[PDB]
Amino acid sequence: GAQVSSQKVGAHENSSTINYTTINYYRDSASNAASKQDFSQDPSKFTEPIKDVLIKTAPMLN
């Protein structure tokens, strides 16, 4: 059941992906560490909540 994932390697040694391994020891999900494998979304629902889609090169009001 070992989970193997990639590290985003910043400072490299004068020394090819580097991985790390994870095993969950407990039955309850709450006990698990944070994966940090998170997703990003586009800000539109906050930045552009208007009904008619805006074209940035066109006049906002027409």
């Binding site: 070992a2 989970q3 193997v4 994932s5 494998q37």
Partner: peptide
């Protein structure tokens, strides 16, 4: 076994 990612 190993679940890779």
């Amino acid at each position: 076994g190993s679940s890779s990612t």
